[PDB]
Design a protein around this ligand. Structure first.
Ligand SMILES: Cc1cn([C@H]2C[C@H](OP(=O)(O)O)[C@@H](COP(=O)(O)O)O2)c(=O)[nH]c1=O
Ligand SMILES: [Ca+2]
Length: 130
């Protein structure tokens, strides 16, 4: 089992990065197991606005690291981010605003939960899958 840890929102950045204060330190977090389009690309504006609204409307923010590396090579935190108990990573996939991606062994605990979400977004022809 993974565990959720406290954070506070500093600011939204784009579809799959968000700035949070974690153990009292400002950090950029990159969402595990997803890829949103860059802001300049199609559905990038929509993905950014999704993640923005989801984190800005929540009152409680949490970080859940997986079993492997907790930071990437750019110094970004690698985690599942929750907003009022709802996983942002999974929400993005479910709405077709991210692809499951960057699935590395040992940091892949929620791989199947997200693939299930992606199949449903694809069935619904949502956004990326339209
Ligand atoms: C999501 C994720 C990205 N990354 C690295 C791989 C990619 O390397 P490159 O920068 O060399 O492409 C980059 C993609 O993140 P972005 O999609 O934010 O660019 O972040 C990891 O190392 N681990 C991860 O879990
Ligand atoms: Ca991206």
């Amino acid at each position: 089992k993974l565990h959720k840890e406290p954070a506070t929102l500093i600011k939204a950045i784009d579809g799959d990065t968000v700035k949070l204060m974690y153990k009292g330190q400002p950090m950029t977090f990159r969402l595990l197991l997803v890829d949103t389009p860059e802001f300049n690309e199609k559905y990038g504006p929509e993905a950014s606005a999704f993640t923005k609204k989801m984190v800005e409307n929540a009152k409680k923010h949490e970080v859940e690291f997986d079993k492997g590396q907790r930071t990437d090579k750019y110094g970004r935190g690698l985690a599942y981010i929750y907003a009022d108990g709802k996983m942002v990573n999974e929400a993005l996939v479910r709405q077709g605003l991210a692809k499951v991606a960057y699935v590395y062994k040992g940091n892949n605990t929620h791989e199947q939960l997200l693939r299930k979400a992606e199949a449903q977004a694809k069935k619904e022809k949502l956004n990326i899958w339209s």
